[PDB]
């Protein structure tokens, strides 16, 4: 491809999206790592906030990823294929579906915490919640890669 303004605009968001993922990943790994040990109830509260940060951050990324497609096609000169653009959107569409589950259990556990539900139940939701995010991020990571292949082959 020939260098152009729009290329670098896409490039930075890939770095910015990657940037956040790499930092907050420490939360994801830290939360699981804490789960193995079996931290007591008092400490458990910390985990909920840690997961909340991850989900909230990802939502912003999903919003940005949607915009990335929009910016790419407006400034693209040449025959852009519909299938690749659509393919990425479907991955985001799946991300939209799954994230609802992540938010749902995020709310459930918090709602459970207020009532005063036993420690073991709260922990079960955390580790289970962590697994769902792992499924969520797979969609995001590959879509991030999808852009890399497309832009280079121009």
The full set of domain ranges for the chain reads: 1-154
Listed in sequence order, the residues at least 6 apart from 16 whose beta carbon sits closer than 8 Å to its beta carbon are: 64
Listed in sequence order, the residues at least 6 apart from 132 whose beta carbon sits closer than 8 Å to its beta carbon are: 98, 101, 102, 105
Listed in sequence order, the residues at least 6 apart from 5 whose beta carbon sits closer than 8 Å to its beta carbon are: 75
Place of tokens 């955390």: 126
d(CA 51, CA 25): 10
Helices (H), the chain: 5-37, 41-74, 82-115, 119-152
Place of tokens 């999808």: 146
The answer to whether the CB of 98 falls within 8 A of the CB of 136 is yes
Residue 153 CA, chain-centre distance (Å), reads: 26
Long-range contacts of 23-32 (CB under 8 A, 24+ apart): 24/53, 24/54, 24/57, 24/58, 27/51, 27/53, 27/54, 28/54, 28/130, 28/133, 28/134, 31/126, 31/130, 32/127, 32/130
How many alpha carbons lie under 13 Å from residue 137 in its C-beta half-sphere?
A: 19
């Amino acid at each position: 491809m020939t260098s152009d303004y729009i290329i670098e605009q896409i490039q930075r968001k890939q770095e910015e999206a990657r940037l956040k993922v790499e930092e907050m990943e420490r939360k994801l790994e830290a939360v699981k790592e804490a789960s193995k040990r079996g931290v007591s109830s008092d400490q458990l509260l910390n985990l909920i906030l840690d997961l909340a940060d991850i989900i909230t951050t990802l939502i912003q990324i999903i919003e940005e990823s949607n915009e990335a497609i929009k910016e790419l096609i407006k400034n693209q000169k040449g025959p852009t294929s519909d299938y690749i653009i659509e393919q990425i959107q479907r991955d985001q569409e799946e991300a939209r579906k799954k994230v609802e589950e992540a938010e749902e259990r995020l709310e459930r556990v918090k709602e459970a915490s207020k009532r005063g539900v036993s420690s073991d139940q709260l922990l079960d939701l955390i580790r289970e919640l962590a697994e769902i995010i792992e499924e969520l991020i797979r969609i995001i990571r590959r879509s991030n890669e999808a852009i890399k292949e497309l832009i280079k082959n121009q």
